[PDB]
């Protein structure tokens, strides 16, 4: 079926991908908006709650 060594490597990819998504998903969304929004907000205003 599946090699034991292969299962270790495949599982490792999930572990790495999990961590990346945990840390990188929200900053990615903020990056997409900041560069593509019309107009482009200020870095300080980008996360200001109501100002």
């Amino acid at each position: 079926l599946g090699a034991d060594s292969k299962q270790e490597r495949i599982s490792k990819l999930i572990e790495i991908s999990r961590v990346v998504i945990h840390y990188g998903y929200l900053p990615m969304i903020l990056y997409l908006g900041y560069t593509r929004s019309e107009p482009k907000p200020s870095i300080i205003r980008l996360l200001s709650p109501l100002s």
């Binding site: 903020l30 997409l32 908006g33 593509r36 929004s37 019309e38 107009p39 907000p41 980008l46 996360l47 200001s48 709650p49 109501l50």
Partner: peptide
């Protein structure tokens, strides 16, 4: 809920 809308096309908003 404090929602800030930065654009409508493309839609982009951040909420606390």
């Amino acid at each position: 809920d404090l929602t800030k809308a930065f654009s409508l096309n493309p839609l982009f908003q951040v909420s606390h």
